[PDB]
Amino acid sequence: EKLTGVKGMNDILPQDAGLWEFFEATVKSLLRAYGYQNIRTPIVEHTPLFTRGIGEVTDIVEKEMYSFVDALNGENLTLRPENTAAVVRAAIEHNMLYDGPKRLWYIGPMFRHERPRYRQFHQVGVEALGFAGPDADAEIVMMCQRLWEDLGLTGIKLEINSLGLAEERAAHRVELIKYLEQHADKLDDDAQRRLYTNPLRVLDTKNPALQEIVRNAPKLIDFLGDVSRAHFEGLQRLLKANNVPFTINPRLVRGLDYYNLTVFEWVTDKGTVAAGGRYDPLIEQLGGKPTAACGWAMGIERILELLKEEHLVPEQEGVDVYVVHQGDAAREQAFIVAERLRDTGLDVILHCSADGAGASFKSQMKRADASGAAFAVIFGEDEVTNGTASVKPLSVQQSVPVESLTEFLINAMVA
Amino acid sequence: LEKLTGVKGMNDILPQDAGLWEFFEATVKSLLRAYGYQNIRTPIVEHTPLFTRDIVEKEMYSFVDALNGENLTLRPENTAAVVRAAIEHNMLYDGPKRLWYIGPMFRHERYRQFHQVGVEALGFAGPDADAEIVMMCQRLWEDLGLTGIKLEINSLGLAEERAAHRVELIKYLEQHADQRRLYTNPLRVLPALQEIVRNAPKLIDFLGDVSRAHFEGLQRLLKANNVPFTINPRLVRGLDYYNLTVFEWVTDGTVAAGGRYDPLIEQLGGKPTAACGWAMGIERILELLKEEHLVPEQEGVDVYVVHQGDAAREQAFIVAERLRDTGLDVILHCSADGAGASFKSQMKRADASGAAFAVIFGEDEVTNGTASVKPLSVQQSVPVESLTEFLINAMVA
Ligand SMILES: N[C@@H](Cc1c[nH]c[nH+]1)C(=O)O
Ligand SMILES: N[C@@H](Cc1c[nH]c[nH+]1)C(=O)O
């Protein structure tokens, strides 16, 4: 009886690997280019980390985490839905901020029961821990822009917003509720549920009849005091100074309650591809010295789909040589020369047959073609006896003294 | 307000360890390309029955899905999941496949989260493929700089041979009243008891000629390629899918382990075939690289941009971006408190960063249209439009 992979948890197969490899190489290089350094936290953490970090009022913590209890230990555990809180957890646990702020990046799988596509998905993300900003905020937004350029993607647009501080949120909440209450007759059931608990999430509505209402809602940005406005405006100053286009979207709210001040999204118009923001309260909330922080994450799969849609999938890398052989004597030689060629820095596949028995030259040569190899290096009885290797570019097949094969191949790749 | 802790046995990997991981990952990934092996990534969880078909008994993190009720397990291992994808996606339709994987694995119980890199040669009868994958391990040690890692091999033959061996082992063990485990798990019975165990019937003497030919052919290839080895007949691995070739790489403990497992594919519902592979615990190899002092040096960025004044900070920002456009790695000074910092403090950060240069902007630099560059010679003024050529030139030495 055949088994299947958990629905919403895809395998990544050799045909897709190159595309992942391109993305990973590109972003990892960008990350180095800004001085960000890798941190890797576990796949599981204690459940309370997410409940306190992300917030009991959110769909993630309520409806969407994979949580369970450890048999032997009775520890409560959850597969990470996200990595910011875990970074905070490691920063606090390991005293990372003793000697100053830290530029951190991470990459790996995350988990979520969502309505539709991916219950296992992958993020790359950054955390700038200990920086008040708004310079740090500008930096991390810029890191995203550079990634699009480096990847070849165009038409990704930045929207920003401020959630201000707690008191300013509270004042705003009041007038928003007072406003939304005026139109309770037209609110849907999802809006009603959220009205008195997280009304900001009502502004995000997709409901057609609510659009003109939500667009005229009281804007959180109008309740920003001096410190907030200065931060938000200073972020905008830096972005302008670097010619980064953007729109202010006051309905931009994220599905994690740790955010304050800056929030931002990168969005494609045929949706969100990168998202982040500042979250100064979080470190204290998880028991740490009060500390400012901002960061972002990207859903890789969603960026990969974009690269496919826009035809930016690079060509499969092939190996340099495919070693073809018949005979016991030839196979030993094929092994030995395969190894020498690799010692030289070449990529080499040595023919091995599904069924164990030697194989026909024609079948091996078909495999050689399919492999993307540039040369077939061929050993039969004559070659073994004469001390040669027969090389065929994938021109005409050529005999070469085996002791010269390396120079021969190197030379020929000069082309 | 209470601090939260990392799950015991699940270590964080922090920046100061990352380079060591990066070195290992880069080295092995390059070796894997060099043999034509291609990445497959399976999920962290699978349906529990996959692993059922000590490890399975005590050692898996299993649980029940709250939404759908389905039974799920954090993978303890990756071979079965590779087989699961190969079957699910019809990977062997057009021929055999050379696969590698890397990622975290989980064991309920020094590491409860640990990491493996491994290979599966799916669809190859061998023993050529067996030789290849063993040889891949040897190359990795050389490339990593590790010495004194030794290969032991063994055959588990086929089921009937395994069974026949059991008989004579029990018959032999029965002759030495010197008892609970004799009838139950006699392999686990192999002090003054050494001379007895050392003369126990060896599984290798019950290999029929299909088995012997495979094992002997593996030995042939290994000898021809100058891979030394010892036959260790006490070598058994901790899962019953292994058939024929089994092998371990050991440091005088096991650092790589693998073998052939032809029955497994059919057992998971696939067209009958052959397969062999291996896996390595990364953490164990990393400890070795530390012990033998093969930890490479941390690499630093090329430039640290230092500034004071509002005008200077904007410029610092813009130039940091231009320098990165040109291929340099750059850290832009940003302060905890958001405002400026002292030249001395910034310069301390510049030093600690491993940057090769501090590029400095104050009000004079902004006005004059210059950048002040200090190697980490003396501090030198340069037209900002030339900073790139300046820095590149300076690094060529
Ligand atoms: N962790 C957030 C993004 C983020 C990173 N840093 C701050 N916010 C998410 O999963 O969307
Ligand atoms: N999966 C095995 C090793 C292996 C890979 N392929 C075959 N065996 C392990 O975890 O030890």
Residue numbers in the entry:
A (entry chain A): 9 to 124, 128 to 281, 286 to 409, 419 to 439
B (entry chain B): 8 to 60, 67 to 122, 128 to 196, 203 to 214, 219 to 280, 286 to 409, 419 to 439
Quoted from the paper:
We solved a 2.65 Å resolution structure of HisRS, a class 2a aaRS, from the gram-negative bacteria B. thailandensis bound to its cognate amino acid L-histidine. B. thailandensis is commonly used as a model for B. pseudomallei because of their genetic similarity and its far less pathogenic nature. A comparison of the human and the B. thailandensis HisRS structures reveals a backbone RMSD of 1.13 Å. The sequence homology between these two proteins is 24% identical and 42% similarity of amino acids. Unfortunately, the human structure is an apo protein so we can only speculate as to the similarities of the binding pocket residue interactions for the human protein but we see homologous human residues for Tyr269, Tyr270, Thr92 and Glu90 that likely play a role in hydrogen bonding of the cognate amino acid in the human protein much like they do in the B. thailandensis HisRS structure.
Aminoacyl-tRNA synthetases (aaRSs) charge tRNAs with their cognate amino acid, an essential precursor step to loading of charged tRNAs onto the ribosome and addition of the amino acid to the growing polypeptide chain during protein synthesis. First, the aaRS combines the specific amino acid with adenosine-5′-triphosphate (ATP) to produce an activated aminoacyl-adenylate intermediate which reacts with the appropriate tRNA to produce the aminoacylated tRNA. In general, aaRSs are divided into two classes based on the global fold and sequence conservation. Crystal structures were determined for a CysRS from Borrelia burgdorferi bound to AMP, GluRS from Borrelia burgdorferi and Burkholderia thailandensis bound to glutamic acid, a TrpRS from the eukaryotic pathogen Encephalitozoon cuniculi bound to tryptophan, a HisRS from Burkholderia thailandensis bound to histidine, and a LysRS from Burkholderia thailandensis bound to lysine.
